[PDB]
Amino acid sequence: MNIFEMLRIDEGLRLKIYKDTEGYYTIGIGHLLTKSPSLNAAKSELDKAIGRNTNGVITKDEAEKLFNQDVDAAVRGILRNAKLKPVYDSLDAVRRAALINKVFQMGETGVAGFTNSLRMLQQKRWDEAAVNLAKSRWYNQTPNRAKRVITTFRTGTWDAYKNL
Structure with missing residues (x-):
């Protein structure tokens, strides 16, 4: 067991924009997209994050890429x-x-x-x-x-x- 598998158990994996437990727009492995109530705001943040027109949906690979970034940013965040x-x-x-x-x-x-x-x-x-x-x-x-x-x-x- 490692932080990645631990987090993958806690957050799940969703390839389509979804609303988290708080009601916010999320995708992949717990990647918060926006606190904004707009799904359009959400798809925009999503496309910006992935670097392509996603139309609300991403591949496994893209999700894992986001995940890698987020774990890294969390660790560096702690260290700072x-x-x-x-x-x-x-x-x-x-x-x-x-x-x-x-x-x-x-x-x-x-x-x-x-x-x-x-x-x-x-x-x-x-x-x-x-x-x-x-x-x-x-x-x-x-x-x-x-x-x-x-x-x-x-x-x-x-x-x-x-x-x-």
Whole structure:
């Protein structure tokens, strides 16, 4: 199991524009296109991203290309953030995957707001941090995914995903 397979389990793969859990226009492997309510705004962002007239639909390959970019951007994002970097450096390889998952889903900024949870992870207070992370809109909105990520942080193993 690695961050790519982990994320592919959590986000799915869709070759046609679709609306995410929040109602936003997405395609491929959880690639947010726009928060705009316009499907036209969405197809435009899509064509810009792919470099061709897509007409709302992409190939597997194009989806994977977007995915490669996004994982890379999430990692670099962590490494550039002064709140995230240190947490990341303090974690083992499994937990790192967990932070990348979070950041991929909810942007740098978002995650950076889990101040208290970040501190607990940093201090290796696994159980406490699992409990704190659950007190969030994130957890309430997408409980099955949040639970999987949470488990990953609590145990430092890929158990939650071995299942899936």
